[PDB]
Amino acid sequence: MRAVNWNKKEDDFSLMFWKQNIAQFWTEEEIAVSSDKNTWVQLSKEEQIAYKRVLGGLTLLDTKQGGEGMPLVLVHLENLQAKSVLAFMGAMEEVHAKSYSHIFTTLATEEEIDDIFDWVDNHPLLEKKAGIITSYYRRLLKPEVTKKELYMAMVASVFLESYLFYSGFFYPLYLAGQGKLTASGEIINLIIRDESIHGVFVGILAQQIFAELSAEEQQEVQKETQELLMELYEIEMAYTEEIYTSIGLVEDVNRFVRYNANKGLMNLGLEPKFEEEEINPIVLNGLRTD
Amino acid sequence: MLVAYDSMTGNVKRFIHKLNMPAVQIDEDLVIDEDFILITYTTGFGNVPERVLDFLERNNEKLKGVSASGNRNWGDMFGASADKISTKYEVPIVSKFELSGTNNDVEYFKERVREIA
Ligand SMILES: Cc1cc2nc3c(=O)[nH]c(=O)nc-3n(C[C@H](O)[C@H](O)[C@H](O)COP(=O)(O)O)c2cc1C
Ligand SMILES: [Cl-]
Ligand SMILES: [Fe+2]
Ligand SMILES: [Fe+2]
**Fold (topology level) of B1-117:** Rossmann fold (3.40.50)
- Total count of residues recorded for chain A: 290
Kindly report the nearest CA distance between residue A129 and chain B, in angstroms.
24
Give φ, ψ of B3 to 5 degrees: -115, 115
Q: State the number of CA atoms in the 13 A half-sphere of A289 facing the CB.
A: 24
Collapsed DSSP state (helix, strand, coil) of residue B70: strand
Q: Domain residues of chain A, as ranges? A: 1-290
Q: Spelled out in words, what is the top-level CATH class assigned to the domain A1-290?
A: mainly alpha
| C-alpha to C-alpha distance for B91 and B63, rounded to whole angstroms | 7
Q: Domain residues of chain B, as ranges? A: 1-117
What is the whole-number distance in angstroms between the Cα of residue B43 and the centre of ligand 1? 5
Q: Beginning with the edge strand found earlier in the chain, give each strand of the sheet holding B63-70 in spatial order.
A: B23-25, B2-5, B36-40, B63-70, B93-98
| C-alpha to C-alpha distance for A198 and A89, rounded to whole angstroms | 7
Chain A from 172 to 191: CB within 8 A of any B CB: 189
* A107-126: b (≥16 Cβ within 10 Å) or e: bbeeeebeebeeebeebebb
Any catalytic annotation for residue A100? yes
Kindly calculate the radius of gyration of chain B based on its CA atoms and give it in whole angstroms: 13
**Does residue B11 have its Cβ closer than 6 Å to ligand 1?**
yes
Cβ of A20 within 8 Å of Cβ of B9? The answer is no
Closest atom of ligand 1 relative to the B9 alpha carbon: 25
What is the whole-number distance in angstroms between the Cα of residue A161 and the centre of ligand 4? 5
Question: Which residues in chain B belong to E strands, given as ranges?
Answer: 2-5, 23-25, 36-40, 63-70, 93-98
Tell whether residue B103 is among the known ligand binding residues: no
Cβ of B71 within 8 Å of Cβ of A288? The answer is no
Nearest CA to ligand 1 atom 21: B99
| C-alpha to C-alpha distance for B34 and B28, rounded to whole angstroms | 17
Q: Report which of B18, B19, B9, B15 is spatially closest to residue B43, judged by C-alpha positions.
A: B9
**How far apart, in Å, are the Cα atoms of B27 and each of A28, A184, B43, B52, B56?**
35, 43, 17, 9, 11
Sort out which chain A residues have CB atoms less than 8 A from B71's CB and list them. 196, 263
In chain B, what is the straight-line distance between the N-terminal and C-terminal CA atoms, in Å? Answer: 9
Residue in chain B lying closest to A27 (CA): B45
What is the whole-number distance in angstroms between the Cα of residue A190 and the centre of ligand 4? 11
Closest atom of ligand 1 relative to the B7 alpha carbon: 26
Cβ of A284 within 8 Å of Cβ of B72? The answer is yes
Q: How does DSSP assign A54-100, residue by residue? A: HHHHHHHHHHHIIIIIHHHHHTT-S-HHHHHHHHHHHHHHHHHHHHH
Contact A257, A240 (CB under 8 A): yes
| C-alpha to C-alpha distance for B71 and A234, rounded to whole angstroms | 25
| C-alpha to C-alpha distance for B72 and A202, rounded to whole angstroms | 19
Give resolution, Å, one decimal. Answer: 2.1
Collapsed DSSP state (helix, strand, coil) of residue A277: coil
- Total count of residues recorded for chain B: 117
Residues 6+ apart with CB under 8 A from A274: A258, A259, A261, A262
User: Would an 8 Å CB–CB cutoff place A22 in contact with chain B?
Assistant: no
Residue B96 DSSP label: E
Q: Which amino acid is at B65?
A: G
